[PDB]
């Protein structure tokens, strides 16, 4: 293991007049009131090249570049008179205007990660004093700033290529070595970023200084220098196409749980056993008269747009990391995804769209009394959500084998193709529904089990 470093230096409580911003407003504006939300701009954005990479996080859209790139000169080539170490303390203070916006944005609920189910943001708190989201600032915000320093194909919002060509010109102007350059473009990103990654051995010393003055200068959490551990994070994930994918997944799952709570408040609360509403009747079956509609049609729209974002985030992630799945990447990195089935909620199937208008919450949004109908007398068999034709050519696979609470693994059993495509889609929405009001769960479970088996 390594150690921490000096100093108590950087007493720049008022660093300088930073022209960038005092508040990172990508999830609306600070309370009072909201508005000013930045969004995950989709693929094929010209300002980010061909945008072959993943979509653009809103926080990275309003990333606090501070005074490395800045404005008041239209789009200023800001590093020609300004510096880079103001960003050292505006990683510190841009995450002090954002650890006072941790403390307000993240720790009062004007961020997405900010708000949990109902208790809020202080009942949930990691060991390092911080409401959840600063562990995702050293990881999200800090790594994204280091990414801005390095940059993938998706150039961020000010043609970061101009700043990188400046790094070639205006930062390779005798930094770090003399004008006798070392290496070239290969070993540019690791000479002016190996005495900026070799002093991100010291910018990680400087970001552990950042956290230790998040402890000693603005004291929302007081301990030694340890942001997420005294070491920089693992490689192969700091890739913007991966870290941004993880950010997108966490944000999506948090706000999906949010909409789940809202539809609880409209179909668990304000709702009934069939999740209907005031005078829901036929009519068009027992469809919602509206009380759920405007509380769940918003969920349908949200899933539509987030699917439009995820469909081709996932494709890029897979083809870049062939052999790993997007759900695999997301689910264990954020414990709030454990109830999310990105396959089910994002099925590319018109029958799925029709039969599950409200995604995995269809059974807890619009209920027509799920009921297995026997062999005769107006069989309702195809009239429910359906099943693929069985694929003949699948290969025996050892993925998704359970892991024993022994901690062991089965290590040798292979799932038959007949079983790994066993069709149990119907069962999932019912399972999601029957979290509540038990002893009806079994009643609906037997019916949906019959229809699945049939």
């Amino acid at each position, epitope marked *: 293991t390594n150690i921490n470093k000096s100093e108590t230096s950087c007493d720049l409580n008022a660093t300088n007049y930073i022209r960038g911003c005092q508040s990172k407003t990508y999830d609306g504006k600070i309370f009072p009131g909201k508005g000013g939300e930045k969004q995950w701009i989709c693929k094929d954005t010209i300002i980010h090249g061909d945008t072959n990479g993943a979509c653009i996080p809103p926080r990275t859209q309003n990333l606090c570049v501070g005074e490395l790139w800045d404005k008041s000169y239209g789009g200023r080539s800001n590093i020609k008179n300004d510096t880079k170490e103001l960003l050292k303390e505006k990683i510190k203070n841009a995450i002090h205007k954002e650890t006072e916006l941790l403390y307000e944005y993240h720790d009062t609920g004007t961020a997405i990660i900010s708000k949990n189910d109902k208790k809020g943001q202080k009942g949930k708190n990691d060991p390092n004093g911080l409401p959840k989201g600063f562990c995702h600032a050293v990881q999200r915000s800090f790594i994204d700033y280091k990414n801005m320093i390095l940059g993938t194909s998706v150039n961020i919002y000010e043609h970061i290529g101009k700043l990188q060509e400046d790094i070639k010109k205006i930062i390779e102007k005798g930094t770090p070595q003399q004008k006798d350059k070392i290496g070239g473009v290969g070993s540019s990103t690791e000479n002016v970023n190996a005495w900026w990654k070799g002093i991100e051995r010291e910018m990680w010393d400087a970001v552990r200084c950042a956290i230790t003055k998040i402890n000693k200068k603005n004291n929302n959490s007081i301990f030694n220098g340890d942001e997420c551990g005294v070491s920089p994070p693992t490689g192969n994930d700091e890739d913007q196409s991966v870290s941004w994918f993880k950010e997108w997944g966490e944000q999506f799952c948090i706000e999906r749980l949010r909409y789940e709570q809202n539809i609880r408040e409209a179909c668990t609360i304000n709702g009934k056993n069939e999740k209907k509403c005031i005078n829901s009747k036929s009519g068009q079956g027992d469809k919602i008269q509206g009380a759920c509609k405007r509380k769940c049609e918003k969920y349908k729209k949200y899933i539509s747009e987030k699917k439009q974002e995820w469909d081709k985030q996932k494709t890029k992630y897979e083809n870049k990391y062939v052999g790993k799945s997007a759900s695999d990447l997301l689910k264990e990195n954020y414990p709030e995804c454990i109830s999310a089935n990105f396959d089910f909620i994002f099925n590319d199937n018109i029958e799925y769209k029709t039969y599950y208008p409200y995604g995995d919450y269809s059974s807890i949004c619009s209920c027509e009394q799920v009921k297995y109908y026997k062999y005769n007398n107006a069989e309702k068999k195809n009239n429910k959500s359906l099943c693929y034709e069985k694929d003949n050519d699948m290969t025996w696979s050892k993925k998704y084998i359970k892991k*024993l*609470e*022994n*901690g*062991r693994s089965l290590e040798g059993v292979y799932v038959p193709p007949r079983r790994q495509q066993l069709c149990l889609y119907e069962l999932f929405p019912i399972i999601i529904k029957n979290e509540e009001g038990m002893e009806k769960a079994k009643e609906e479970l037997l019916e949906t089990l019959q229809i699945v088996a049939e």
Partner: antibody
Amino acid sequence: VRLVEYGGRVVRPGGSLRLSCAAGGFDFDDYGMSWVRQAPGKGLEWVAGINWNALDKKYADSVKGRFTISRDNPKSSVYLQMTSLTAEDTALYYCARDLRNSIFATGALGNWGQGTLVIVSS
Amino acid sequence: IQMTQSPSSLSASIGDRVTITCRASQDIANYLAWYQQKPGTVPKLLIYAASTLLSGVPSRFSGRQSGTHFTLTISSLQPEDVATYYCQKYNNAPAAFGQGTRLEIKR
């Protein structure tokens, strides 16, 4: 042949704490494990016991529901998660192994660890 | 399940025979082990199966059983045998230890 515990700490009353126990040349895969606590200047007291495959977990009547035991054989560790700690649970906690590989949680504790103090106070 | 161990403070002198009793309320037929603990150390298992002396233990120890009365006998008490003895039963559920008998030198 070598058991060491981690997690001994001073915790607020009603808090939580996770003790861990390693294993040495010991083949920590088919031996049951147990946790035994000794309050300062008192007699030993069995606390928890876990089977070889962790399909059988037994707890002392006093520490029940408040205590959870678990294994992780590839990591070769056994953990005790403790919650709602009272002022009376202040004790030196030992992790011990059966001296006989078997299919039961409880057995004769042949090898013991050095133990960790779990002083509980405000 | 309780394990009543008595006496609690048995005294003796070097060369004496020392007997410790560990009455068990229920039937454990022979799933009982004896533990010796000197001050400030980990316990050491002396006897298991209520009679089977563990290897390396001095042969002056012995353990016998009558129904649910288990007795540990030190034939020739030695100055390095002054400790507490615990008689933990391990048949099934609570595997509870005994109260603990503390030997002392009689002067």
